[PDB]
Design an enzyme around this catalytic site. Sequence first.
Site: not given
Length: 754
Positions: A180, A230, A239
């Site tokens: 992210n 996560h 990811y």
Amino acid sequence: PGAAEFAALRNRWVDQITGRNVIQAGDPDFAKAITALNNKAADSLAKLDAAAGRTSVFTDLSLAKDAEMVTTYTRLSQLATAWATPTAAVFGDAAVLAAIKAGLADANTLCYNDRKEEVGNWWSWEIGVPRALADAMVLLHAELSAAERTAYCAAIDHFVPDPWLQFPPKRGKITSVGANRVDLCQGIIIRSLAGEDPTKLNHAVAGLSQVWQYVTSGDGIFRDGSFIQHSTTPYTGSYGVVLLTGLSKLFSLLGGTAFEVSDPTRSIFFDAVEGSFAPVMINGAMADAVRGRSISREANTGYDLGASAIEAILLLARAMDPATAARWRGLCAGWIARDTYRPILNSASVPRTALVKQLEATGVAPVAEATGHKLFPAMDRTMHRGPGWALSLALSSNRIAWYECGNGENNRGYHTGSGMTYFYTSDLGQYDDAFWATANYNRLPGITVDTTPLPDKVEGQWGAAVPADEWSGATALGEVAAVGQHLVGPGRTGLTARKSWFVSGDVTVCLGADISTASGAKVETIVDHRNLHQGSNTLTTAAGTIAGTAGTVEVLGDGRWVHLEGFGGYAMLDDSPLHVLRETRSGSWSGVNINGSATVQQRNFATLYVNHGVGPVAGSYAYMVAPGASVDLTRKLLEGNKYSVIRNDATAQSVEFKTAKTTAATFWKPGMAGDLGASGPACVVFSRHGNELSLAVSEPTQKAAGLTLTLPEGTWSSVLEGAGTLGTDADGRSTLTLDTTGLSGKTKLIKLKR
Ligand SMILES: [Hg+2]
Ligand SMILES: [Hg+2]
Ligand SMILES: [Hg+2]
């Protein structure tokens, strides 16, 4: 740096994303890439809402659904890419340009602007739209007005004022991490090129550094090569790939400019190519065990993710020292050459095609996947290879969640952390060919499972996402690994099991002990659940064949072995009955993902399991798997004491490999397993060579300061390699005391001399 430098960067970014500088005349792969680009652009143009006062840009995408708002913007950036790609059908087309601009204008006015507060998934507002919108702004720079650029930067800055953070203000903003962080930074970096903002650009570049700093808990890269996202999910394969892709693109874009990434600690990220990514690449696919919720995606598969990783590694290779570049290119050439199932050039973009062609032109030979063991204790994952196979184990623990679901994705994946045994082989499509649409989510290969049905999105006691178990962990010495998992079942059933795996260069021995549950339901252990595609693959036994009739389960003979055509052999190492079922299963991707297609896929399976029954008391199993074994070799597995169960109970589990002259053990409690003992939880593998004893040991709880072994094979006088303190016990046995403070489940290699 000023206007000229910003124009150069925008042009470099357009070069990268279009491939306009690197298209080869007459190359058939480039031609197919231009076709795929044309077909998509045409599909999007035909779907444009042409109405006066339209409340959508595309007739099939609602701006009030945040995902479809993203797709609205990626369609627009795709159209802008095509519009900027020489030889594309819509290249430089004025009507297409007008349609893109009206789309961006109307999406802004109707939905995505600086006066709108986020509704629904933050990721759509902060990552999905800004990366696309920013690309579009950079592709269309010469054509967009001052007013348009101002509005579109104002919208991105409203939703992402600082890419080091995430979430709308209403929520409390948190530090963005990992994938992210990279994605937020990318959106701002590209937006900073469109708006010529060096301050924002520099901040966003600086934000990248955090993602490759080693961590010791939670999200990030670990020194052992694990990658968690996560908080509690192994995530290198999805990811991690996002991270890898974004860094490859940004490093390439900024390289040799005033904004170049010069943080010397980026070497940690480069080290992750071999330390993190390569071991979980299997013939072109990222292992399912490290891709979390993405297993539920029909069109974001292990091969899709592996192909993205290969593109990224080839791009990064350009900037490395010669030896490293060549190594990375050889790894990639191998992942491409062995993958005849989803060849990387099929549906590849123009940029991807260029990198794969560049690789082919270097003449770098394909590198094989090395046999042996790669352990990732921080993320409860291990990889094991031998000729023709790769085993990926999926465990869970007080550090690592049973599974990860969200946004309608992977809600049924609750058993995927219960000791799965993925055997990857030359059946390249085993896990890809509608496996996750059709498999029995209660009988995944390798698991122990309480048959109590669990609801989609199930959680544990008090909402826990992680099992409160004793330990999961592993060690390995040379050709043999020892892996253990104290399984606590998901869904509050009270299932407990002690599962271990002893993996050699050819065969995997699977032991289970101390099995019970509180639910009142029967408990099973799954020897295999194997996709046969449309096949009728024969199951051969000592007595003939078994499970010839789909839907009719049969119990194996006293021969104790079964061979599956196209796969290899299985053999029982105890007296447990083995149930064998040939079955036809059906399901759609919509059944496992809210976004999945309604098309029903039908697949044949072979399913082999032990039934521990209702109310087991210290239930157990013992079996082995021999991927690639012929019928004749399978028939012979149980002959001549080749695979010796030394102990299999609530204290310890251990196997000796005759040919390898190596013994492996997991300890749950202080005790002995044959002539090896441990003072507490441990994984150990040992082998004597003449007057030297070699050992691998881990302290798998990750919490004990010390561990003492009672050594096998008589007396030992000196420590040749590694650290540890020899002593003698009351019975005259040699002991080895280890300082395990802070070892984080890592292996200590020790060599002793008589
Ligand atoms: Hg909206
Ligand atoms: Hg701007
Ligand atoms: Hg979940």
